[PDB]
Amino acid sequence: SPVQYLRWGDPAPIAAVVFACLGLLATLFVTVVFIIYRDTPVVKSSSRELCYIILAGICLGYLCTFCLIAKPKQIYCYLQRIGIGLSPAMSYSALVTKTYRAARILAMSKKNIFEMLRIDEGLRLKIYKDTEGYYTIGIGHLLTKSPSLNAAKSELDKAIGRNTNGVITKDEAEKLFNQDVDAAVRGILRNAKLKPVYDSLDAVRRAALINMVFQMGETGVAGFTNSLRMLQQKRWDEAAVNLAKSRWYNQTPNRAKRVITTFRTGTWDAYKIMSACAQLVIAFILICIQLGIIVALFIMEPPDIMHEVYLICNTTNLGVVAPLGYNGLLILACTFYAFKTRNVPANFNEAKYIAFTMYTTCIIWLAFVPIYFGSNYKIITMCFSVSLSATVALGCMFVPKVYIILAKPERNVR
Numbered sequence: 001s002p003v004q005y006l007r008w009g010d011p012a013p014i015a016a017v018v019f020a021c022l023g024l025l026a027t028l029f030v031t032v033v034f035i036i037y038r039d040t041p042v043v044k045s046s047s048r049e050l051c052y053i054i055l056a057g058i059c060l061g062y063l064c065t066f067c068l069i070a071k072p073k074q075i076y077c078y079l080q081r082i083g084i085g086l087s088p089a090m091s092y093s094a095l096v097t098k099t100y101r102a103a104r105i106l107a108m109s110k111k112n113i114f115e116m117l118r119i120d121e122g123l124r125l126k127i128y129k130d131t132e133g134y135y136t137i138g139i140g141h142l143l144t145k146s147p148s149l150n151a152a153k154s155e156l157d158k159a160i161g162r163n164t165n166g167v168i169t170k171d172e173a174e175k176l177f178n179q180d181v182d183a184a185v186r187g188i189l190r191n192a193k194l195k196p197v198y199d200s201l202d203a204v205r206r207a208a209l210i211n212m213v214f215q216m217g218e219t220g221v222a223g224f225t226n227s228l229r230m231l232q233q234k235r236w237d238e239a240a241v242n243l244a245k246s247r248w249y250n251q252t253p254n255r256a257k258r259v260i261t262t263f264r265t266g267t268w269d270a271y272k273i274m275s276a277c278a279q280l281v282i283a284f285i286l287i288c289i290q291l292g293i294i295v296a297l298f299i300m301e302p303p304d305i306m307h308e309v310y311l312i313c314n315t316t317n318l319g320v321v322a323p324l325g326y327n328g329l330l331i332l333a334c335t336f337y338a339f340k341t342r343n344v345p346a347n348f349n350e351a352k353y354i355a356f357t358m359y360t361t362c363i364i365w366l367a368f369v370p371i372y373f374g375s376n377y378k379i380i381t382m383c384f385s386v387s388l389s390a391t392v393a394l395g396c397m398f399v400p401k402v403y404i405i406l407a408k409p410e411r412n413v414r
């Protein structure tokens with residue numbers, strides 16, 4: 001009885017049980033809220049089905065405390081090992097599936113910009129110089145400002161990760177172009193004239209603005225004050241009419257016609273250019289791998305009480321460390337794809353929060369390695385550890401969305 005341990009001068013059990021219960025309530029609230037408001041654009045935009053798996057994971061994370069603070073029965077040693085290994089595996093298998101898909105969507109998004117400017121500006125697959133005289137390759141990608149061609153080859157090889165002999169492929173030029181886009185988009189957001197326009201525009205019309213920036217630079221695109229304001233107000237037909245009067249249109253009419261037409265339609269029409277049930281099956285597989293590890297260890301080192309509210313089991317270091325390792329890989333993958341997609345604005349900046357969640361989760365899990373092994377109160381540290389990691393995931397991912405559903409029904413709009 002955790003109440004008895006409180007009476008005696010030990011409040012750790014009762015704390016753990018309370019943390020866990022507030023956890024379950026909060027998860028039950030968040031869940032029933034997502035069911036009720038499933039039709040709205042803040043739940044329907046993301047993967048509704050993966051969230052249920054993430055919430056089950058969080059839920060089961062809180063339920064672990066009821067097998068760690070338990071009566072000495074055989075099955076609770078079985079459920080301890082299932083819960084402490086499978087609850088994070090449910091949350092992060094679902095999450096890594098979500099973040100990987102965001103990353104593939106981001107990659108395929110950057111491919112259109114690249115195809116756009118391949119057609120508009122060109123591409124050389126072997127080293128050349130710009131009109132200054134500095135070594136360049138692909139879509140005007142700068143290598144070095146050194147007169148040494150070897151330096152250019154040197155920095156190219158580093159940039160790609162093979163000996164290129166100064167020659168690359170379309171896909172390695174794409175890779176290089178994505179640095180130059182990110183660079184150009186940083187300049188734009190540092191620039192008070194361009195920043196509000198880029199903010200306003202959909203993905204396709206941002207491609208159009210980056211194109212112009214790539215042709216005339218930032219200070220040049222800031223020239224088009226009126227045209228820029230027309231686009232901000234989403235006045236497409238009038239922005240086209242105005243830009244079609246420019247020195248820009250009269251000096252490079254072929255490229256200008258295409259960029260302008262793209263500002264009108266918000267489509268790719270002017271240029272030559274990941275499932276749902278898949279994510280459940282992949283998430284389910286990634287989770288059965290963790291089950292395989294736990295069931296394997298149940299045969300190698302069968303669960304058994306050691307022999308009292310702290311239920312102590314025989315679980316050896318390999319019983320702890322094997323699932324820990326796999327959970328760690330899941331976390332590191334999640335963090336990797338999350339960070340890759342951190343600035344993706346889709347679904348009310350879902351990506352910004354997920355990145356923050358994963359950064360926290362890394363410091364927590366890495367912290368609780370020396371803490372747990374260095375500790376003589378392992379069942380308690382395990383209790384607070386699981387619940388904390390689960391609260392972080394619920395806190396940083398689900399609260400921000402439940403907030404908008406409940407507090408800001410007006411902003412809950414596509």
Ligand SMILES: COc1cc(/N=N/c2ccccn2)ccc1NC(=O)c1ccccc1Cl
Pocket residue numbers: 057058059060061084085087088091320324364365366368369372373385386387389390391393
């Ligand atoms: C960070 O602590 C843990 C959290 C766990 N679940 N979190 C959850 C669970 C559900 C949803 C989100 N998050 C599971 C095991 C944990 N710890 C360990 O298994 C462990 C054991 C020994 C040494 C170090 C560690 Cl890190």
